[PDB]
Amino acid sequence: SRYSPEFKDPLIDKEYYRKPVEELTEEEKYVRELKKTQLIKAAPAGKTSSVFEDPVISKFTNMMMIGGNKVLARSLMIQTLEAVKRKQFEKYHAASAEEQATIERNPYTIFHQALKNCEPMIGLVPILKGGRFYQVPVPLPDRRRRFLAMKWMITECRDKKHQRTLMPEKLSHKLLEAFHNQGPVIKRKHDLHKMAEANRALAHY
Amino acid sequence: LHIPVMVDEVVHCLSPQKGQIFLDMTFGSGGHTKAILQKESDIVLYALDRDPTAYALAEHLSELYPKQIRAMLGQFSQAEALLMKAGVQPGTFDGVLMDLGCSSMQLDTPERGFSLRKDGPLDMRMDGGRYPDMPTAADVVNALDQQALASILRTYGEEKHAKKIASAIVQARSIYPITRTQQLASIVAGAFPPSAIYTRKDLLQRSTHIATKTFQALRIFVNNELNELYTGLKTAQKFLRPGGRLVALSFHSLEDRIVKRFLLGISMTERFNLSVRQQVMKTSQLGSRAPLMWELIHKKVLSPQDQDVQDNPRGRSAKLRAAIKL
Numbered sequence A: 001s002r003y004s005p006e007f008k009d010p011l012i013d014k015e016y017y018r019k020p021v022e023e024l025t026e027e028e029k030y031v032r033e034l035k036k037t038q039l040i041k042a043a044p045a046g047k048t049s050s051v052f053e054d055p056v057i058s059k060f061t062n063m064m065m066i067g068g069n070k071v072l073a074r075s076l077m078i079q080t081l082e083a084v085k086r087k088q089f090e091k092y093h094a095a096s097a098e099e100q101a102t103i104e105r106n107p108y109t110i111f112h113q114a115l116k117n118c119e120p121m122i123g124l125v126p127i128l129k130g131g132r133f134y135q136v137p138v139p140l141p142d143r144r145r146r147f148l149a150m151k152w153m154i155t156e157c158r159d160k161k162h163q164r165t166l167m168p169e170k171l172s173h174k175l176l177e178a179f180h181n182q183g184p185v186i187k188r189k190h191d192l193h194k195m196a197e198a199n200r201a202l203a204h205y
Numbered sequence B: 001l002h003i004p005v006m007v008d009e010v011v012h013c014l015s016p017q018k019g020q021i022f023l024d025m026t027f028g029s030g031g032h033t034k035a036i037l038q039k040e041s042d043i044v045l046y047a048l049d050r051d052p053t054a055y056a057l058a059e060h061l062s063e064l065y066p067k068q069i070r071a072m073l074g075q076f077s078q079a080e081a082l083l084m085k086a087g088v089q090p091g092t093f094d095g096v097l098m099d100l101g102c103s104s105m106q107l108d109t110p111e112r113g114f115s116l117r118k119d120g121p122l123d124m125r126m127d128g129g130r131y132p133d134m135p136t137a138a139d140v141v142n143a144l145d146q147q148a149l150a151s152i153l154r155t156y157g158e159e160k161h162a163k164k165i166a167s168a169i170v171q172a173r174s175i176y177p178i179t180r181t182q183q184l185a186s187i188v189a190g191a192f193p194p195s196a197i198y199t200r201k202d203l204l205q206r207s208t209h210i211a212t213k214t215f216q217a218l219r220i221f222v223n224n225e226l227n228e229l230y231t232g233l234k235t236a237q238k239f240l241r242p243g244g245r246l247v248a249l250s251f252h253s254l255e256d257r258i259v260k261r262f263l264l265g266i267s268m269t270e271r272f273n274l275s276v277r278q279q280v281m282k283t284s285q286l287g288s289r290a291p292l293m294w295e296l297i298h299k300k301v302l303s304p305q306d307q308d309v310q311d312n313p314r315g316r317s318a319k320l321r322a323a324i325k326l
Ligand SMILES: Nc1ncnc2c1ncn2[C@@H]1O[C@H](CSCC[C@H](N)C(=O)O)[C@@H](O)[C@H]1O
Pocket: B025, B026, B027, B028, B029, B030, B031, B032, B033, B048, B049, B050, B051, B054, B074, B075, B076, B077, B099, B100, B101, B102, B103, B104, B106, B126, B223, B225, B228, B229
């Protein structure tokens, strides 16, 4: 890294700075006087203080990026969010006053809940025993569960089964499926859990 | 003459009876196949062999019984397809007699190249030119490196001196091509002092040439008898009727293990000759078998009568493993 270990990561949070002094604790008062003597890394081009900043969608965009083409990756993302919103406005206008209350039209709420429905609680590890391989179940950390939900969704949309369908239509269709606990990605979660149940007797390895 | 090995046991074991259809995956000379068509005149039988000369014998012998014997040609792996063309995919074969090894005719005829004692082309190939591109033992020895050829001898020949007997072959081939049986035998002997030529002994305690383990090793790598034996047994099981008696004959340990580990479900990747002590040590580490698909008619391997061994020393090591499908 071109940053010496002395450089600290920047904290981009407007609220963190406007917080009054009186509310601060003696520990939080020390952290603030300390950072005034520390070197701070330049803020990356990715994240800003904008009110529309979403770290989860920004991460999903990077996991879709091919060969540093962020413009294309982000274009696909915003086209998916627009396709999700238009599909829900079409379902909303076609519904009755009672069903309309249950129809979600916010694509960020759908995107977040769609991924949370795909996160696998437990996973498997390929372990070797006596020249023979047997998988072992293990709890998954929070980072790993969130990463696997985004990798399974992107992998499913890149599958060759989809013929000539553009990515914003594929991803929007899969997100709305997972939002309703349906789809291939939800099945992958269920299969991983079901396999991790058939190997419970192998938890001692 | 070569009497069919353990013919009395194999006949009693399969108890051929009217209304039963049987298969024979190794017709060869046909001594066993004919002993089975004698007890039951109403029997139905199917034959198979890898040797076209053996398949011609069956065709010539088909005259004796027009339909009771049906001759087929091909390897164990190709047997299912050949029999699938007939359409007997379920098969419901009452018994499959999978005799193993080299035919008496194959190794009594010097031209076939199986006998080190005689002088024939170094073929050592059960195939009789049905596939003229199939490598012969001469090709195997002239091409493979010391490490590669040593493995053939070590794994298939049970030969301690695999590096010593393989280096001699590598040096000899460079000087001249290895194309005759005696030429190879002399090369293998030349790896050891001259007295070594007959130091080794068989279980019969009769002196054997010091290259009897290289002729067996190549014989099994040229004809891939071991890998073809696993598919051959598997195919028999699929084509074997429930309640049908299988009978194999293993003349050496490597084939005997596969038959034992197949009729008992034991994994083929387990360690050989495991003692009770080692079995305890193996499982103690993990602490931190599937239902059998066979019912062994005779629990322990049968063997030829000692008197019969002297009459037919070639079959001394015949280990008969009988089982009934489950
Ligand atoms: N993979 C294979 N598929 C088919 N036949 C094979 C084979 N490996 C060996 N054989 C043949 O099976 C026979 C075994 S030795 C001869 C036994 C025979 N019952 C007899 O009449 O003596 C030989 O003819 C050999 O060429």
